[PDB]
Amino acid sequence: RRRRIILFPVPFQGAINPILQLANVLYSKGFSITIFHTNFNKPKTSNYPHFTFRFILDNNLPTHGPLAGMRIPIINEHGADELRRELELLMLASEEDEEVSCLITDALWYFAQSVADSLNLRRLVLMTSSLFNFHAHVSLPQFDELGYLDPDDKTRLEEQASGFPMLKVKDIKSAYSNWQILKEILGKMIKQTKASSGVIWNSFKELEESELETVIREIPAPSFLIPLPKHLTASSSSLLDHDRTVFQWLDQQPPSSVLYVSFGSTSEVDEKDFLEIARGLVDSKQSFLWVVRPGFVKGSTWVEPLPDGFLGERGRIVKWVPQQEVLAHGAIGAFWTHSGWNSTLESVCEGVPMIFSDFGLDQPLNARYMSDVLKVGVYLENGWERGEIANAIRRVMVDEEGEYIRQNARVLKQKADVSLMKGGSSYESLESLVSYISSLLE
Ligand SMILES: O=c1ccn([C@@H]2O[C@H](COP(=O)(O)OP(=O)(O)O)[C@@H](O)[C@H]2O)c(=O)[nH]1
């Protein structure tokens, strides 16, 4: 292959997944692929015989928990010299007829821009969160001087934000609840994304059409929107063993009778709220498949606080599944999600309507957009209460009053499918991306 692309993900599941989906999309278009990766949380290299892996940067920190994410600031602050040596030696060791076209990194690797610059290597960024999230980010000054960033101030919560009517004030509070902490790294990510040679968004035009103008205005480099879950699932980059019972169980369930439930990799709840969630599921009387990661419940290894047989025959709790493949199964009627972007987009691409909870960061923004703009789910935006949970589940899955949500999800899946076909917005965006990358050396 004449042209090689180097991709460098952040080593967590929700960041590895889109990068390796993109790597496959680019390999399909004729590029050779080198993955730079930490030894930490490395994927199964034997699932990618067509890729070359080069392990870097970590050849005392915990492997799990919120402290695991400390690797990202540390590598941003201390990895430049090593990344440069690794990039330069690969650039030098290339075949006579081969050329390294560009580096693609997670936007969170803001340190890679100066490194790539110093080698005259173009860097493109893969955004793993939405255009709407970015639009909210760049509106933070206007939020600030309206005081919305004031955790000890608790007013106008249910009001729409002025100048940003798609959001409520509480959404902004929740999303930027750690602002004073994160404003530094957030600012660096945005700066070095704007300074990049191109931004790839895991999205599609018909999903976030209200946001395109913002990214054209705010980012000089070209933007490309590609809905990676419509190209392929992320099953090959799973860091955990998929549960081997769920599909046999799903085959025993009537169509659209199952609520899939997963609250995310790092989310955490009190025992009180955990039990209230369980009560709401039982009260809904719907069948459910619930992925609970060990540690989800404060103070318990897994799901100890659940009483024996409390979930009855209608429910299953597992630790890990191939999520997009589950969402594609005919038994699934709805998805109760924490509103992480991969999960939300997977559900959209499989046409599954959603019930939304959130645990901060971009999740409240995703829930608000999907529930109020697209109207493909119900946002539980006032905590955990068994009656409200049961009503939301049933509205999406059973009630005739929720038909519009179910139909809106079906229509949006069809729009994603159309965007991939020749002539569609995603197809042409990918065509532009391939031509752009191919042009970078001339
Ligand atoms: O049992 C599970 C739970 C999650 N996922 C995948 O893990 C990723 C989770 O990313 P997301 O952005 O939704 O949220 P996070 O867990 O990073 O907060 C998605 O690709 C899911 O399909 C999976 O394959 N199986």
Author numbering: 11 to 69, 78 to 460
From the paper:
UGT76G1 is a UDP-glucose (UDPG)-dependent glycosyltransferase, where UDPG is the sugar donor and UDP is released after sugar transfer. UGT76G1 alone performs β (1–3) glycosylation of Reb D and Reb M in S. rebaudiana. Our data establish that UGT76G1 can transfer glucose in a β (1–3) manner to an existing glucose A at both the R1 and R2 positions (“ends”) of the steviol aglycone. The enzyme UGT76G1 shows an unusual degree of plasticity in substrate recognition; it is able to transfer a glucose to two different ends of some steviol glycosides despite having a single active site.
